[PDB]
């Protein structure tokens, strides 16, 4: 079945960002295959998709139902394996015989035509038998490029629910995590974590650093990192002939805009600063900007503009790292 007992409906914290999904999944458990079929959950990374699929599976199993969980990529890989071993038929029969199929990360179905075809047939069978299907994806079906149209209509015949990890929810999670890892529910720590994380992965990442360096050790280290990013800005300046005060704003001047690009690039490439961190460094708050900025810098790679940047990288290192 491939279920990890640690995920449960009971330890799924509910907030207004994941309520629909949660409620729908729960309604479905009380009337397996008869109310909603299929259920298609979507949301960005670290948002509850896998947890919710697996919590449903654990419930259905604890109730006596036959369950299979699998990510689409492993599904694809398993189907190709059975096909060459001569067992494609045990592959189908396996999947066609469950009370509850959980296919996680459906996006990865793209390109895998055979896999899609084989999944359609499994989908139909379970469906005609009113067997429950729960899918999860990082994007809405309408954004599934590379997945057949027929699979997409089918998904759209069911219930589609977006899932989010909202602030009230992270907050509660953060409290749970701090007890998990034996830290204190201290306002500053809880606050620090709220401002600097979106995932549980990032929360555990910060916690790891806190246990290692102490909460105040992390603050010091991060302060130093910010200082260095500023040192890089000072650097790009003195070389480009633009002031600092200047380099930090949306002033499109190609004498600044082109210094802003390399800088961000240097912060990214020389100090290993995250996008968010770089974004914060250069007073602004959003996505786009940075990403494509660093892109443009790679457009210049097409050996010309490379040697400059290369030279700037090396100097920045010796002077700031
Ligand atoms: N509502 C929630 N309550 C408690 N923990 C959660 C919740 N949502 C996500 N998590 C935890 O965050 C981590 C990422 O969850 P996961 O289901 O893998 O997200 P996704 O599959 O959307 O990437 C898991 O450890 C999960 O248990
Ligand atoms: Mg997941």
UniProtKB/Swiss-Prot annotation:
GO terms for cellular component: cytoplasm; plasma membrane. SsDNA binds at residues 80, 112, 114-115. ATP binds at residues 13, 46, 48-51, 104, 201. Belongs to the DnaA family. This is Chromosomal replication initiator protein DnaA. It comes from Aquifex aeolicus (strain VF5). Keywords: ATP-binding, Cytoplasm, DNA replication, DNA-binding, Lipid-binding, Nucleotide-binding. Mg(2+) binds at residues 50, 105. GO terms for molecular function: ATP binding; ATP hydrolysis activity; DNA replication origin binding; identical protein binding; lipid binding. The chain holds residues 77 to 399 of 399 of the full protein. Its main location: cytoplasm. Domain I is involved in oligomerization and binding regulators, domain II is flexibile and of varying length in different bacteria, domain III forms the AAA+ region, while domain IV binds dsDNA. An ATP-specific conformational change within the AAA+ domain accommodates and stabilizes subunit-subunit interactions necessary to support oligomer formation. ADP-binding does not allow oligomerization. Probably binds dsDNA via flexible domain IV.
């Amino acid at each position: 079945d491939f279920l990890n007992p640690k995920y449960t409906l009971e330890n799924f914290i509910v907030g207004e960002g994941n309520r629909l999904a949660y409620e729908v999944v729960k309604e479905a458990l009380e009337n397996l295959g008869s109310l909603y079929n299929p259920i298609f959950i979507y949301g960005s990374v670290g948002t509850g998709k896998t947890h919710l699929l697996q919590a449903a599976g654990n419930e259905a199993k604890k109730r006596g139902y036959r369950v299979i969980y699998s990510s689409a990529d492993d599904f694809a890989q398993a189907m190709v394996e059975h096909l060459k071993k001569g067992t494609i038929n045990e592959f189908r029969n396996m999947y066609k015989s469950v009370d509850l199929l959980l296919l996680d990360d459906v996006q990865f179905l793209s390109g895998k035509e055979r896999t899609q075809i084989e999944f359609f047939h499994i989908f139909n069978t379970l469906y005609l038998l009113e067997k429950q299907i729960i899918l999860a994806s990082d994007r809405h079906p309408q954004k599934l490029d590379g997945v057949s149209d027929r699979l997409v209509s089918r998904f759209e015949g069911g219930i589609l629910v977006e899932i989010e990890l909202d602030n009230k929810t992270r907050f509660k999670i953060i409290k749970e995590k701090l007890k998990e890892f034996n830290l204190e529910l201290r306002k500053e720590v809880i606050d620090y974590l709220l401002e600097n994380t979106k995932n549980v992965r990032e929360i555990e990442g910060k916690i790891k650093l806190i246990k290692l360096k102490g909460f105040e050790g992390l603050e010091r280290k991060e302060r130093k990192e910010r200082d260095k990013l500023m040192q890089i800005v000072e650097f790009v300046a003195n070389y480009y002939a633009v002031k600092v005060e200047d380099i930090l704003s949306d002033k499109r001047n190609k004498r600044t805009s082109e210094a802003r690009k390399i800088a961000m690039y240097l912060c990214r490439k020389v100090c290993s600063a995250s996008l968010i961190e770089i974004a914060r460094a250069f007073k602004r708050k959003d996505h786009t900007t940075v990403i494509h900025a660093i892109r443009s810098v790679e457009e210049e790679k097409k050996r010309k503009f490379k040697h400059l940047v290369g030279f700037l990288e090396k100097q920045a290192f010796d002077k700031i790292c």
